[PDB]
Each structure stands twice: as structure tokens, then as C-alpha cells.
């Protein structure tokens, strides 16, 4: 044996950071046979013992709730018969990493944009990275672009939720590394939505202008259904159209009521679509097209009138019934007429709406005479009423 102090086999560390407040113990272990005697300066000046301050049995130096007054260059002289040797640790002390500005807790609507700040106060001797966990899973949210942007810029850890969904309801938890420390911030993000499009959507006892309505309810958007509302589309329709309902208002606990008010010989489908506080939800998928029972046409045509014509003419005329208050299939028209004080009608049937005119053109017609002249309506399923009588003229040209 027989050798000087030698730190090569157990060199001091170069430089140690520690958290302000903290413990610190440097080493000092040199090889030595005879063991060395260590003692420790602080740059020129001698380590006193002191408060937070003490010699440890193998030569370390324990500080105790580091101040950045104790950083420093520390150095430990051992000394032997052989010699003596030296080791160098700088001490850093290091502020705490701290966020500032932290995500909050929210209860909000699908649709929103909102922001999950993440600002720190560090101190500047140290880098930092952030890290978002997502139900406890790390994730820099990417893979879910146009949902998620990082905003702020490279000294922020700021997240911003696009368009936010139900499945982005959760728990977030930022996280600023620095070195080997941490420090972290958690959220609950509880997302509420519109009511899913009701389902099974079921139309029964169709009558000429009722039909009865079934659903049932959609998926749950985390806020119950106050209501429901009722659209149909026909040929007629510009798209889908509401309906009158009896009850006037469904309750969210009402999944049936009766469609009023719809003209017969229509072709009609219904949807739903439910509401809650949340707003208005995405209607259901279409019913099954229906046809409304047909019926007797109950409406004789407006402004019947006419005159005017050729030689021997009686000129009728009328406006058209519009197509959805014909009612059936087979409209048509049936004219009559007779001579002012005769009391007999003579009629015939009109059997293409096309166009409601009708000229008589005979010998029998007498010129510029005044004509008593009704116009009614008839379909497949019945006969309708006949218009107010009128008095038209017979041509006047001889």
C-alpha cells in the first residue's frame, strides 16, 4: 500500500443543481492509504460549521435548506503523508419551476373553441418542457388535428380546443418538466351536446289529414331532452317543413303524438329531432314514405266567370284548385249552365284539370244572353261542392 489522495477512481461530481430549499450533501472520497484528512472551502474561504451546515463522517458536506446564497464553488484539499489533492463541485441553486397561469375547469357545449392556458415562471438557469396528459395518457394531440392547437409560442405550453366534441370530455393535466423536477396542473373538461337524432321513427293510423308518430329517444349528449319537434317532406314541400302536432308542445318524456293539418292523397315522410338546453339536436333519420288517406275534394273552385268569345259561344272559366286541395286521384271539374229563368241545368263533366275553361259553341246558344253558370269539383273518392252561382255572358259576335 502506501499512496497519495486520489479522486480518479471516485471523482467529484463537475457541477450539482438543487431546488432552493432543499438538501445537499457533496461528496469528497479520495483513495488514500493512509486514509486522508479532507476539509472544505467555499471558493478562498474555509467551511465553518453553521446552523444548516456539518462535516459528515466520510468527508461530505451536508447543506441544509439551500439558500442561492450557498451556491458557490466548493472544493475539497485532502492531505496525506503522501500529499495532498483537490476535487471541484460548483454548486447551482436553482429557483422552483412554478405555473402560473394553469387550466381551468369547465362545463361547456359542443362546438366551442376554448383554451387550457399553461404559463410558468422558471428560473432562467434551466430549460423546461411541457407535456399534456389526456385521461392520464401522454399526447401532444396531433393525431386529432383540426381539434387541437398549440398556441402561445415556444415559451408556452398553452392548448387550444377547436370545435370540442363529447369524446374530448376528460381530465387534462399539464406538465413542466425542468431537469429532474415537475410540476403539473389538472382539469376536468365536462362536454355537453344537442340530443342525438332520435331513432325508430314509426308512422301509424294514417287517416286523410292525421297520422300518429312514434319514436324513440336518441343517444344521451349529457343534458335530457325538454322537447321534441316534428318535420315531414312532400313533392309540395321545399324539403322538410314542421308540422302541427297534437300535443302543441312534446315533452322530452313523450315519445309519440299525432301529425294535424296534413292534406289527403300527399306523400309524406316524418323525422324528429329532440332539444335540450344545450339547443336544437340532429334530426333522425327519415320514416318510412307514407301515402295520407284520399278524401272528397271539399273546396269549388274561386272566380268562376267568362264571356266574350266567336260567333254562337258561351265562354266559361274559372281558377285552378290547386293540386294539394284536389284531395284524390281522377280531379276534375263538372260546368253547369242554363239560361237565366230556366230553371233546368244542363252540365258536363271535365275530366282534365289542365285547363279550366270551357267553351260552348252550338246554334242553342243564344248571342250576348245572360247564362246562370256553377263550376264544381269530383274526384275518385266522391263528389265536392259546386261554386257560387254566377252570371256570364254569351258571346255578342252574331
Same mark, same amino acid.
Given at each position: ?111 366551442? !373553441? ?127 317543413? !314542421? ?125 250576348? !244572353? ?23 255572358? !254569351?258571346?255578342?259576335?252574331?
Amino acid at each position: 500500500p502506501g499512496s497519495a489522495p486520489d479522486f480518479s477512481r471516485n471523482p467529484m461530481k463537475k457541477m450539482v443543481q438543487v431546488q432552493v430549499g432543499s438538501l445537499v450533501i457533496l461528496d469528497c472520497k479520495p483513495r488514500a492509504s493512509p486514509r486522508a484528512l479532507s476539509f472544505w472551502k467555499k471558493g478562498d474561504m474555509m467551511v465553518r460549521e453553521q446552523a444548516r451546515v456539518s462535516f459528515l463522517n466520510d468527508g461530505g458536506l451536508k447543506i441544509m435548506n439551500v439558500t442561492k446564497a450557498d451556491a458557490g464553488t466548493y472544493t475539497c484539499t485532502a492531505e496525506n503523508q503522501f500529499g495532498k489533492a483537490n476535487g471541484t463541485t460548483h454548486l447551482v441553486v436553482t429557483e422552483p419551476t412554478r405555473i402560473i397561469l394553469a387550466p381551468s375547469n369547465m362545463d361547456v357545449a359542443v362546438g366551442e !373553441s376554448v383554451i387550457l392556458p399553461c404559463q410558468v415562471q422558471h428560473d432562467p438557469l434551466l430549460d423546461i418542457m411541457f407535456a399534456w396528459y389526456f385521461n392520464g395518457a401522454l399526447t401532444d394531440f396531433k393525431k386529432d388535428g383540426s381539434h387541437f392547437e398549440k398556441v402561445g409560442g415556444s415559451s408556452s405550453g398553452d392548448l387550444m380546443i377547436r370545435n370540442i366534441q363529447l369524446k374530448h370530455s376528460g381530465k387534462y393535466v399539464c406538465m413542466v418538466q425542468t431537469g429532474v423536477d415537475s410540476v403539473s396542473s389538472a382539469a376536468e373538461l365536462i362536454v355537453r351536446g344537442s340530443p342525438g337524432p332520435p331513432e325508430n321513427v314509426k308512422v301509424d293510423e294514417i287517416t286523410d289529414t292525421t297520422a300518429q308518430l312514434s319514436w324513440t329517444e336518441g343517444t344521451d349528449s349529457h343534458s335530457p331532452v325538454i322537447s321534441y319537434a316534428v318535420q315531414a317532406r312532400t313533392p309540395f314541400s321545399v324539403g322538410w317543413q !314542421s308540422v302541427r302536432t297534437v300535443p302543441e308542445v312534446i315533452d322530452g318524456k313523450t315519445h309519440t303524438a299525432t301529425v294535424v293539418e296534413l292534406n289527403p292523397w300527399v306523400e309524406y315522410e316524418f323525422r324528429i329531432v329532440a332539444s335540450n338546453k344545450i339547443g336544437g339536436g340532429e334530426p333522425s333519420l327519415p320514416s318510412e314514405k307514407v301515402r295520407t288517406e284520399e278524401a272528397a275534394p271539399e273546396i269549388a273552385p274561386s272566380e268562376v266567370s267568362g264571356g266574350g268569345g266567336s260567333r254562337s259561344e258561351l265562354v266559361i272559366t274559372w281558377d285552378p284548385v290547386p293540386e294539394e286541395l284536389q284531395n284524390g286521384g281522377g280531379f276534375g271539374y263538372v260546368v253547369a249552365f242554363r239560361p237565366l229563368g230556366v230553371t233546368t241545368w244542363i252540365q258536363t263533366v271535365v275530366t282534365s284539370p289542365d285547363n279550366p275553361r270551357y267553351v260552348f259553341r252550338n246554334e242553342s246558344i243564344v248571342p250576348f !244572353s245572360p247564362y246562370e253558370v256553377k263550376v264544381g269539383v269530383y274526384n275518385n273518392k266522391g263528389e265536392g261542392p259546386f261554386s257560387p252561382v254566377t252570371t256570364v255572358f !254569351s258571346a255578342e259576335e252574331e
